[PDB]
C-alpha cells in the first residue's frame, strides 16, 4: 500500500507488549517501510489460500487475541532482517532487499510454520502441541534462514543436504534468538511448543539425543521418512555447531569453544561461498574448515576447534 | 507481460507434439491470454525459489528437451481450465478467472508436484521413479483441483478431511483425463511414474488394494504418518467414486454404475455447496446423497447408487 509510515503498539503471542512499524492509508496496515523493500504481514483467515489479505487495522493498536500472531510475525521478521543486515551485511534474504511477506492464521489447528519458496506461513497450533508459531523467534528466524539458503547454497531438501539445510536454519535461528537477547538458549521452539509442559522443546542443539535425534554420525537415520531424515540427522550438525561455539567433550573428543559470533561468521561464510545444492556432511566439514581458514588462518584455534567438533560427531 | 497473443508449437514430456498459446513481446512467452486472466508458466531453473522467471523463448518453437515439462504444464493447465469451465461452469479455481501460474524445473531430482496455496509447482523427477510430473494430465488436474477445494470446501489437510481432499483431487484428475480422451483410465500418475516398468501407477481408484491402500473403512490407517493417512485413506473414497461411476460388487455389496458425468456432477455439487473444512467421511456420504437428491430426486437410481457405493466401502 502507499501511505504514511507510522508506529503502532500491540501484544504478541506470549503477552509481551511491543511497538511495530505500520503504514497508514485509511486503515493502519502491517507494512514496515523501514527495512529494505518492506515487511508485509497478511491474514490467511483460517484458509489455505495464500497470501490472504494484507493485515488492516482501524486504530493502530493490536491487543486483540486474534492480532497476536500477526504482531510477532511482523516484529520478528524485522529483528531477523536486522540481524542479517547488522551482523552479516546482508540486505534481506536475496541480498538485494527483497520484501519479506508472512501470512498468519493459516488453516485451522495447523501445527507448523514454513517458508514456501516465496513467503513465510504460520499456523496457530492446536493449542495443545503448539500455540501460534510466530511467538517463537527461533522458529521465525529458522524459517527465514531457509529463504537465505535457497538464494545462496540452494541445498536440496533431502538426505544429507536437507539435513544440512535444516541444521543451518536451527543455528541461525538460535543466533538470532541470542542477538535479540530473548531468554536465549540452545533449544528450538521452546516458547511455542506444548504450553502445558515446562522445560521441553522440539529439538535440542546442546543435546540432540534428549529427544531421540542422533548426536553422532554412527547414529544417523538411513531410511526414507522425513525426506531421508532431514529433521532427524540435523542433530549431528547441530551438536557440532554447539561444540564449536560452547566447547565440551563429546564421545571422548574435547573441543575448545570459540563462541557464538565466530560460529556465525564461519557458517555464514561456508553457506554463502562454499556449499552447493548437493553438499553432504563431509563437504560441510571441508567448507567450514576452509571458511575458518579464510577468516582466522590455517594455524588458528578457530580452525582447530572446527576440526575437533566434526571429529567429535564422527564427520570426516 | 503485455504483447500480442499467438500460437507456438512444441513437444511434451512423452514426445507428443502440441500447439500452445503464447504471447509475443520481443521474446515469445508461455502466457496464454485466451483463458480467464491468463495461464503463465515459469522456469524455476532447478532452484526452490518461486515462481522463478516467466518462460521466454526466442522463436516460438518448444522442441528442446528442457522445454518439455513447460509445454505440458502450460498445455494441461489450459485443458483443466476448459474442463471446469465447459463442464461445471466454473471460471478458474476461484470462480472469477484467477490467473493460473505454474513453475517447472523445481529443485533437482524432485519426485513430486504440488499446489502450494498460490501456484502449481512441478519437479522433473529423478528419471527412475518419475519423469517430469507435468507430463501426466491426471497429476496436473489433481493438483489444480486442490486449488478449487481450497477456495470452496476448504478441507483441511489432515485425517479424514485431508483424505477427502486427496480423493477429490484423484476423482477430478481422472475425470479431466477422460475429458481430454488421453488414453483414459482409473489409475493415477501412470504416464509419469517409473519409466522402466509398464503397467503400474502411484495409486489405483478401481482397486486401491493393488498398491496396499485401503478399499474399505475397516482397513483405514489410524496412525500419524502422512498427516493421518491423507494419501492412504483416500483409497476408500476413490473406490466409492469408481463404484458409483462404473458399478460392481465389492465385499458382497452390489452397485449399479451411473457413469462419469453424473459422478462429476454429484461430487462437484457436494464439494461446492455442502462440504466444510472439517467434514469427515460420514459427512461426505450425506453430502453426496443430498447432492444426488438435489439433482435427480430422492427416489432416483442415482441416489440409490450413491448409498450402495458408500455402504460397499463401509462408510455409514
Ligand atoms: Ca486495533
Ligand atoms: Ca529461549
Ligand atoms: Ca530457542
Ligand atoms: Ca512446553
Ligand atoms: Ca525455441
Ligand atoms: Ca491414462
Ligand atoms: Ca490416469
Ligand atoms: Ca511405470
Ligand atoms: Zn526448517
Ligand atoms: Zn493431492
Q: Who contacts A200 (Cβ-Cβ below 8 Å, separation ≥6)?
A: A190, A193, A194
| Right CATH for A6-154 from 3.80.30.20, 3.40.50.2300, 3.30.70.1070, 3.10.170.10 | 3.10.170.10
Rg, C-alpha atoms of chain B: 19
CA distance B26 to B159: 50
**Of A230, A232, A233, which Cα lies nearest the Cα of A162?**
A230
Residues in B whose CB is inside 8 Å of some CB of A read 46-51, 107-110, 116-118, 121, 150-151, 154, 156-157, 225, 277-278
**Of A124, A113, A108, A106, which Cα lies nearest the Cα of A195?**
A124
Q: Do domains B6-154 and B155-315 have the same CATH topology?
A: no
CA distance A141 to A269: 18
CA distance B66 to B14: 13
Phi (first) and psi of residue A308, to 5 degrees: -55, -45
Neighbours of B252 (CB within 10 A): 6
Cell of A252: 571422548
* CB-based contact B39:B74 (threshold 8 Å): yes
| Per-residue buried b or exposed e for B200-233, using 16+ beta carbons within 10 Å of the residue's own CB | ebbbbbbbbeeeebbbbbebbbeeeeeebbbbbb
Q: Mind giving me the DSSP string for B94-107?
A: TSS---EEEEES-S
A258, with CB counted inside 10 A (0-12, 13-18, 19+), is buried
Q: Mind giving me the DSSP string for B168-220?
A: HHHHHHHHHHHHTTSS--SEESTTTB-TTSSS--SEESS-GGGGT--SSGGG-
What is residue A183's three-state secondary structure? Answer: coil
Cell of A132: 501460534
* CB-based contact B171:B75 (threshold 8 Å): no
Q: Residues, chain A, total?
A: 316
Residue A200, marked binder: yes
Give the CATH class of A155-315: mainly alpha
Q: How many CB pairs under 8 A join A and B?
A: 53
Residue A61, marked binder: yes
Locate breaks in chain A with C to N over 2.5 A; list the residue preceding each.
none
Handedness of CA B167, B168, B171, B176 (dihedral sign): negative
Handedness of CA B39, B40, B45, B48 (dihedral sign): negative
Q: Which residue of B has its CA nearest to A225?
A: B225
Helix (H) or strand (E) holding B188: strand B187-188
Cβ <8 Å between B109 and A225: no
Q: Residues, chain B, total?
A: 316
The alpha carbon of B152 and the centre of ligand 9 are apart by a number of angstroms equal to 30
Cis peptide before A51 (omega within 30 of 0): yes
Can you name the residues that pair with A53 across neighbouring β-strands? Answer: A43
What is residue A23's three-state secondary structure? Answer: strand
CA distance B6 to B210: 45
B177 vs B76, B93, B173, B307, CA distance in Å? 10, 18, 6, 26
Can you name the residues that pair with A219 across neighbouring β-strands? Answer: none
B24, HSE (Cβ side, Cα atoms, 13 Å)? 9
DSSP state of B130: B
Instruction: State the first-to-last Cα distance of chain B, in angstroms, to the nearest integer.
Output: 52
Neighbours of A5 (CB within 10 A): 12
Strands (E), chain A: 4-11, 17-25, 27-29, 31-32, 39-43, 53-54, 56-57, 61-62, 100-104, 113-115, 120-122, 187-188, 203-204, 248-250, 253-255
Rg, C-alpha atoms of chain A: 19
Neighbours of A57 (CB within 10 A): 17
Cβ <8 Å between A47 and B116: no
Structural biology method used: X-ray
Q: Which ligand is nearest to the CA of A56?
A: 1
Cell of B71: 509445454
B204 vs A194, B175, B235, B241, CA distance in Å? 39, 14, 8, 12
CA distance B39 to A228: 35
What is residue A232's three-state secondary structure? Answer: coil
For chain B, the farthest-separated pair of C-alpha atoms sits apart, in whole angstroms, at 64
**Of A79, A84, A143, which Cα lies nearest the Cα of A117?**
A143
Distance of residue A301 Cα from the nearest chain B Cα, in angstroms: 36
Cell of B214: 485401503
Resolution of the experimental model in angstroms, please? Answer: 2.0
Can you name the residues that pair with B114 across neighbouring β-strands? Answer: B121
Cβ <8 Å between B49 and A150: yes
Phi (first) and psi of residue B114, to 5 degrees: -160, 155
A124, HSE (Cβ side, Cα atoms, 13 Å)? 20
Cell of B120: 502449481
Q: Who contacts A67 (Cβ-Cβ below 8 Å, separation ≥6)?
A: A10, A11, A57
Residue with cell 483414459: B184
Residue A183, marked binder: yes
Neighbours of A8 (CB within 10 A): 21
* CB-based contact A133:A139 (threshold 8 Å): yes
CA distance B230 to B228: 6
DSSP state of A193: B
Instruction: State the first-to-last Cα distance of chain A, in angstroms, to the nearest integer.
Output: 52
Picking from A49, A100, A223 by the largest number of B CB atoms within 10 A of its own CB, the best residue to mutate is A49
CA distance A177 to A174: 5
Residue with cell 489432515: B158
CA distance B174 to B205: 9
Q: What are the chain B neighbours of A121 within 8 Å (beta carbons)?
A: 117
* CB-based contact B127:B140 (threshold 8 Å): no
Picking from A45, A49, A102, A117 by the largest number of B CB atoms within 10 A of its own CB, the best residue to mutate is A117
The 3-state DSSP composition of chain B as helix, strand, coil percent (nearest 5) reads: 40, 20, 40
For chain B, give every domain's residue range: 6-154, 155-315
Amino acid at each position: 500500500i502507499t501511505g504514511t509510515s507510522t508506529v503502532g503498539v500491540g501484544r504478541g503471542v506470549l503477552g509481551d507488549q511491543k511497538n511495530i512499524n505500520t503504514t497508514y492509508s485509511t486503515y493502519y496496515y502491517l507494512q514496515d517501510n523501514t527495512r529494505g523493500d518492506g515487511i508485509f504481514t497478511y491474514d490467511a483467515k483460517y484458509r489455505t489460500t495464500l497470501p490472504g489479505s494484507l493485515w488492516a487495522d482501524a486504530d493502530n493498536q493490536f491487543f486483540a487475541s486474534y492480532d497476536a500472531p500477526a504482531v510477532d510475525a511482523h516484529y520478528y521478521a524485522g529483528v531477523t532482517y536486522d540481524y542479517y543486515k547488522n551482523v552479516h551485511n546482508r540486505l534481506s534474504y536475496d541480498g538485494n532487499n527483497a520484501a519479506i511477506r508472512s501470512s498468519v492464521h493459516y488453516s485451522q489447528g495447523y501445527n507448523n510454520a514454513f517458508w514456501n519458496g516465496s513467503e513465510m506461513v504460520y499456523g496457530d497450533g492446536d493449542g495443545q502441541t503448539f500455540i501460534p508459531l510466530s511467538g517463537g523467534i527461533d522458529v521465525v528466524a529458522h524459517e527465514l534462514t531457509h529463504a537465505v539458503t535457497d538464494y545462496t547454497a540452494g541445498l536440496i531438501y533431502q538426505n544429507e543436504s536437507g539435513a544440512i539445510n535444516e541444521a543451518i536454519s536451527d543455528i541461525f535461528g538460535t543466533l538470532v534468538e541470542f542477538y535479540a537477547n530473548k531468554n536465549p538458549d540452545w533449544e528450538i521452539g521452546e516458547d511455542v511448543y506444548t504450553p502445558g509442559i515446562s522445560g521441553d522443546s522440539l529439538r535440542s542443539m546442546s543435546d540432540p539425543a534428549k529427544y531421540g535425534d542422533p548426536d553422532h554420525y554412527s547414529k544417523r537415520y538411513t531410511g526414507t521418512q522425513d525426506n531421508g531424515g532431514v529433521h532427524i540427522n540435523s542433530g549431528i550438525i547441530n551438536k557440532a555447531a554447539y561444540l564449536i561455539s560452547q566447547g565440551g567433550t563429546h564421545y571422548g573428543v574435547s573441543v575448545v569453544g570459540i563462541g557464538r559470533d565466530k560460529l556465525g561468521k564461519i557458517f555464514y561464510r561456508a553457506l554463502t561461498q562454499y556449499l552447493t545444492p548437493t553438499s553432504n556432511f563431509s563437504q560441510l566439514r571441508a567448507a567450514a574448515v576452509q571458511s575458518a581458514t579464510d577468516l582466522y588462518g590455517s594455524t588458528s584455534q578457530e580452525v582447530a576447534s572446527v576440526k575437533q567438533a566434526f571429529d567429535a560427531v564422527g564427520v570426516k
